């Protein structure tokens, strides 16, 4: 019945490290694409 | 006269006239200009995908 | 008194194993949903990042060959 359990305690923390690991990568990514969008407006304005 | 145009660099570098040096800068320029605002427009359309 | 709030707080304590069994098998599933996911994800972002390298690519030969070009 508490043996098989621990692969239960397992699994959400495999879990949340792969969430933890995805949001990061589309937090970091967006604030790429939105500083490259900043440039594109700044280096429009100086045109 | 022969003293100050002598000591100054300013004064005998700019002894009145304008060879096509001036012309050249602006060809220099006016060319620079153009690629770097065709370049920016590329760098907007593709960008904004 | 520690030993009765931790007999009682065991995760599950008093939910029955088998319904543990469901959630546990579409766990897994929704897993394997979220990494296939992160597979598209993955791929766009290199889409966009290969994107990324063409253009500054042809903006460093467009630098390059109008600096030259005088």
Known sequence: HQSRESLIMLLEEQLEYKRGEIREIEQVCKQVHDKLTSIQDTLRTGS | CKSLISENEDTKDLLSKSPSEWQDIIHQREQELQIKRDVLDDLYRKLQR | ?70
């Open chain 3, 1 to 70: 008194r520690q030993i009765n709030k931790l007999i009682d707080s065991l995760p599950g304590v008093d939910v029955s194993a088998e319904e543990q069994l469901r959630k546990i098998d579409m766990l897994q599933k929704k897993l394997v949903e979220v990494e296939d996911e992160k597979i598209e994800a993955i791929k766009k972002k290199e889409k966009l990042l290969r994107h990324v390298d063409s253009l500054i690519e042809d903006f460093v030969d467009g630098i390059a060959n109008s600096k030259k070009s005088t």
